[PDB]
Write a protein that binds this ligand. Structure first.
Ligand SMILES: Cc1cc2nc3c(=O)[nH]c(=O)nc-3n(C[C@H](O)[C@H](O)[C@H](O)COP(=O)(O)OP(=O)(O)OC[C@H]3O[C@@H](n4cnc5c(N)ncnc54)[C@H](O)[C@@H]3O)c2cc1C
Length: 534
C-alpha cells in the first residue's frame, strides 16, 4: 500500500474530498484506487483537518512509488501486521495462569489464547453486567461491594471510564495497533483506529469486553470470574501454583500478575511471602469541575458544537515555587466524577465519560507528585499505607457517608472553608459534603494546588472561577509499588512469576497496560517454547 500524508482539508469538507485528494496527489484516476484506509485524522488547534491515508492502488505500485521518490509525503506503507512470536507446542500439559482481567490481563490472555496456549484467567471481580449492578448500586444506595466496584471486575479499572487511549513511547512492533484492532474487532468504533485522542466511552467498553471474553473462551481460554488468588505456591525461587480464596489450587509454572494498583491485599500477601517490591512515587490531588461550556468556549468558540472536533479538552502543567509539579490528569470532557473506592471506610475519586461526552461538566484530576522517603516512609508498602490514610480521612470529612469532601474553587484558594454551592453542581455520587479541603491533602500538595489553579486560569479563562467545584481525593493515579521484573518479565526473585500492567509499575493507562499484556504474553510463550523444546 501507498501512504500519503499531510493532506489538509477544511473541517467541513464533503465526503470523498478524501478520494479527490488521493487522485490529485498521486495523479491517478479514481479507477486505479482499489481501496483506502484513514490511518490518521488530526487537526491544527488554532480549522483544517490533517489526514494520512493508506492506499491500495491497482497495478505496479512499486512503479508508482518510484515516480514519487522525490516526494517526502508519499511513502510505502509500513508493515504494521502483528507478529505472533510463537505457537504452543502440542506437548503442553501446563496451562499458564493470568491473574486479573483488566486491559493488561485481557491481552496477555488473548494473545496466549490465539497462540493456542489455553490460558486460565482468574478475576476476583464480576462479569460486567452484574459488576455494573454492584457499582451503580454503590453509587446510589451507598452500599459498597469490596470485590466488585469501580476497581475490580470484568475489564478492570478501564470499564467505568471515558476510555481514552493515550499516546505512547516508541513502538516499532506496533503493539498499540494490535490492541486497537482487537478493540475494533470486538465492536469498538472504527474511529479509534485513526482519530487523534481517541475515546471509547464506558458503555461501549462494556459490550466490548464481553465479546473479547467470548473470543478468548472460543479460542480455548478459560475465564473464572469472582475468583481471587490469595497466595502463591513457592519453592526455591520458583512458583508452581496459586491458591484461590475458596481454598482451591491451580498448578502452573507460568503466572502473570496483572492485578492493578488497587490490589492492596494481594500486595500485602506478596510482601508476606518475600516477593521483591520497591516503593514507587505517585500523584494525588482533587477532581475539579467547571461547566463544559466554559471549556468549549476557551478552546473553540464558534466551532464549538462541531460533531467532529467534539467536546473540548485540555492539558495543564505548573511548576510551583514549592518545587512540586501540579498537572491535570485523565481529563474527561462532559463527564462524571466517579466514586472509585474499593475499600470499606474510604473515599476515592476518579473520572468517567460516555462516548457522547454530553454531561454538564468538564472534569479532570488536578494532581501533584509525592514520593517515598520525602512524603512518607521508604518501606515498599508505605505508599499504600499513605493512600489508605488519605482515603480514610476523606471518608471521615465526607461524613462517614461515602459522600465526598468537596469545596468551591473560590474559598479553597482563600480558606473561606464554609461557603455553599454556586451553579456548578457535583456529579460525584452518592453525593458530597462541603468542607475544608485544606485538611484533605498534605500541606505541600495543597499549597501547590493553591498556586497552580490561578496560574491555570491564565492558560484557560475561568479555570480559577469561584464557583468551580473541587471534589474528593484522587489517590490512585499510578502504582505505589514496583514489583520489579527485569528484561525477563519475571519477578527478580521468583521464576515463573510475571509482574505486569499498572499494578506492577509497568503501565499507566488502558493502551499501555494492554501493550504490556501483549509483551508479557510473548515472553511467557517464548519461555514455555524454550522449555518444551526437548
Ligand atoms: C474511573 C477510571 C477511569 C479511567 N479512565 C481511563 C482513561 O480514560 N484512559 C486510560 O488509559 N485509562 C483510564 N483509566 C486507568 C486504567 O483503567 C488502568 O490504567 C488500566 O485499566 C490498567 O490495567 P491493568 O490490567 O494493568 O490493571 P487493572 O485495570 O486494574 O486490572 C486488574 C484486575 O485484576 C483484578 N484482581 C486484583 N487482584 C486480584 C487477585 N488477587 N485475583 C484475581 N484478580 C485480581 C482486579 O479486580 C482487576 O479487575 C481509568 C481508571 C479508572 C479507575
Amino acid at each position: 500500500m501507498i501512504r500519503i500524508n499531510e493532506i489538509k482539508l477544511p473541517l467541513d469538507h464533503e465526503e470523498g474530498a478524501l478520494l479527490d485528494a488521493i487522485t490529485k496527489k498521486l495523479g491517478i484516476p479514481a479507477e486505479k484506487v482499489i481501496s483506502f484506509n484513514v490511518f490518521r485524522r488530526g487537526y491544527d488547534a488554532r480549522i483544517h483537518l490533517i489526514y494520512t491515508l493508506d492506499i491500495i492502488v491497482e497495478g505496479d505500485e512499486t512503479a508508482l512509488l518510484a515516480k514519487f521518490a522525490n516526494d517526502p509525503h508519499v511513502r510505502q506503507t509500513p508493515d504494521m501486521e502483528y507478529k505472533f512470536v510463537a505457537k504452543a507446542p502440542e506437548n503442553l500439559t501446563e496451562r499458564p495462569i493470568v491473574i486479573g482481567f483488566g486491559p493488561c490481563g485481557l491481552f496477555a490472555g488473548l494473545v496466549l489464547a490465539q497462540m493456542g496456549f489455553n490460558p486460565i484467567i482468574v478475576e476476583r471481580g464480576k462479569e460486567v453486567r452484574e459488576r455494573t449492578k454492584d457499582t451503580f448500586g454503590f453509587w446510589r444506595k451507598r452500599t459498597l461491594n469490596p470485590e466488585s466496584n469501580v476497581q475490580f471486575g470484568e475489564g478492570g479499572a478501564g470499564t467505568f471510564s471515558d476510555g481514552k487511549l493515550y499516546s505512547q513511547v516508541k513502538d516499532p512492533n506496533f503493539y498499540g495497533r494490535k490492541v486497537i484492532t482487537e478493540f475494533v474487532e470486538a465492536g469498538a468504533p472504527e474511529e479509534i483506529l485513526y482519530v487523534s485522542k481517541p475515546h471509547i466511552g464506558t458503555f461501549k467498553l462494556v459490550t466490548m469486553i464481553e465479546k473479547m471474553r467470548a473470543t478468548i473462551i472460543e479460542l480455548g481460554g478459560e475465564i473464572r470470574f469472582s475468583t481471587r488468588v490469595d497466595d502463591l505456591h513457592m519453592e526455591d525461587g520458583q512458583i508452581t501454583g496459586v491458591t484461590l480464596s475458596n481454598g482451591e489450587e491451580i498448578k502452573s509454572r507460568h503466572v502473570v500478575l496483572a492485578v492493578g494498583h488497587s490490589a492492596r491485599d494481594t500486595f500485602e500477601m506478596l510482601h508476606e511471602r518475600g516477593v521483591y517490591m520497591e516503593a514507587k512515587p505517585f500523584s494525588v490531588g482533587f477532581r475539579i469541575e467547571h461547566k463544559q461550556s466554559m471549556i468549549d468556549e476557551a478552546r473553540f468558540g464558534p466551532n464549538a458544537g462541531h460533531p467532529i472536533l467534539g467536546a473540548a479538552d485540555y492539558k495543564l502543567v505548573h511548576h510551583c515555587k514549592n518545587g512540586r509539579t501540579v498537572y491535570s490528569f485523565c481529563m474527561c470532557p462532559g463527564g462524571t466524577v466517579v466514586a472509585a473506592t474499593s475499600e470499606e471506610g474510604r473515599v476515592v475519586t476518579n473520572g468517567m465519560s460516555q462516548y457522547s461526552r454530553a454531561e454538564r461538566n468538564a472534569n479532570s484530576a488536578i494532581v501533584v507528585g509525592i514520593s517515598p522517603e520525602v512524603d512518607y516512609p521508604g518501606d515498599p508498602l508505605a505508599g499504600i499505607r499513605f493512600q489508605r490514610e488519605l482515603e480514610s480521612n476523606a471518608y471521615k470529612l465526607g461524613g462517614e457517608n461515602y459522600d465526598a469532601p468537596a469545596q468551591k474553587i473560590g474559598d479553597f484558594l482563600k480558606g473561606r472553608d464554609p461557603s455553599q454551592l454556586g451553579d456548578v453542581e457535583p456529579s460525584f455520587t452518592p453525593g458530597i459534603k462541603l468542607t475544608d479541603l485544606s485538611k484533605a491533602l498534605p500541606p505541600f500538595a495543597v499549597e501547590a494546588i493553591r498556586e497552580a489553579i490561578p496560574a491555570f486560569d491564565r492558560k484557560i479563562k475561568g479555570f480559577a472561577s469561584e464557583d468551580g467545584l473541587l471534589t474528593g481525593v484522587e489517590t490512585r493515579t499510578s502504582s505505589p509499588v514496583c514489583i520489579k521484573r527485569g528484561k525477563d518479565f519475571q519477578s527478580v526473585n521468583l521464576k515463573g512469576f510475571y509482574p505486569a500492567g499498572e499494578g506492577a509499575g509497568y503501565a499507566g493507562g488502558i493502551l499501555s497496560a494492554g501493550i504490556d499484556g501483549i509483551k508479557v504474553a510473548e515472553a511467557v510463550a517464548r519461555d514455555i517454547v524454550a522449555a518444551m523444546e526437548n
